[PDB]
């Protein structure tokens, strides 16, 4: 029911990345954000894959392109939403997942930087970091990834996808 866009870091080029961000940007809403909108057109799904054969699905808000949460295998993780409407809305994402978590924090930079123990500007971006970020997000579902590395991997995703589509 939600639009899915694919991207892989395996054999990734400047073109494939640019086309990917173009595809994401082409789904962002431009009409004045109404309230009580159809739930089916509130979110876009970004299915990320890497060399390591791992795969995760990010959930992006159509209004601002920001990550509201993600799916890794049979588990789903959401940032704490800001309001009741957003809270109710995210209960319609990844609804058949058995393991379901809402973090005790929102997905904003100040918080993610505090968690990663570093600032945005110092966090190396690129295809190589996004490779590692995708694994880190995946292996979080199996207890492998620690919270600072997770928080760091979110920043890489948000900057390379959300920020990249936003301008």
């Amino acid at each position: 029911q939600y639009p899915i866009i694919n991207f892989t870091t395996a054999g990734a080029t400047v073109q494939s990345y640019t086309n990917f961000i173009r595809a994401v940007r082409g789904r962002l809403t431009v009409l004045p954000n109404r309230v009580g909108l159809p739930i089916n057109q509130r979110f876009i799904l970004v299915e990320l894959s890497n060399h390591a054969e791992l795969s995760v699905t990010l959930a992006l808000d159509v209004t601002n392109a920001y990550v509201v949460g993600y799916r890794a295998g049979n588990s789903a993780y959401f940032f704490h939403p800001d309001n009741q409407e957003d809270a109710e809305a995210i209960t319609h994402l990844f609804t058949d997942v058995q393991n379901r978590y809402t973090f005790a924090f929102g997905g904003n930079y100040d918080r993610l930087e505090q968690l990663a123990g570093n600032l945005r500007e110092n966090i190396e971006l690129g295809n190589g970091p996004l490779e590692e970020a995708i694994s880190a997000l995946y292996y979080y579902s199996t207890g492998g990834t620690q919270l600072p590395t997770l928080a760091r991997s979110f920043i890489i995703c948000i900057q390379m996808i959300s920020e990249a589509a936003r301008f």
Epitope: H80, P81, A87, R100, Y101, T102, F103, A104, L147
Partner: nanobody
């Protein structure tokens, strides 16, 4: 120091309503995320419902959605579970617990919870 006690359980008929109470002593319950779990005869401990400390996130198991309703009352230091349209499949011992893993506001995994109560028994007959 927190101590959780479940009450409200008993014998009912199918289609009936029932309201459970997770009462706390030792600390304020409004300072926790509170979940209900249950264990039916011959079955594993099952996630049922959770309410976040912030009170805006709730979550339910698929088998209880539309039927069960979680809510909190700090006036009494209690978290409720309204159970409607009860069926024999709901027969179980109902436990409540506090979310003990500070990374999550809500979880369906029992490992993320601590300070489990004794449990209150709910039996739905047909």
């Amino acid at each position: 120091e927190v101590q959780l006690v479940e009450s409200g359980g008993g014998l009912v008929q199918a289609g009936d309503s029932l309201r459970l109470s997770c009462t706390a002593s030792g600390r304020t319950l409004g300072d926790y995320g509170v979940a209900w779990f249950r264990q039916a005869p011959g079955k594993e401990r099952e996630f049922v419902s959770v309410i976040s400390r912030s009170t805006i996130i709730t979550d339910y198991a698929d088998s209880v959605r539309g039927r069960f309703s979680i809510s909190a009352d700090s006036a009494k230091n209690t978290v409720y579970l309204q159970m409607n349209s009860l069926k024999p499949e709901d027969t179980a011992v109902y436990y409540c617990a506090v979310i003990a893993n500070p990374v999550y506001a809500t979880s369906r995994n029992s490992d993320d919870y601590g300070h489990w109560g004794q449990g209150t028994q709910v039996t739905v007959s047909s």
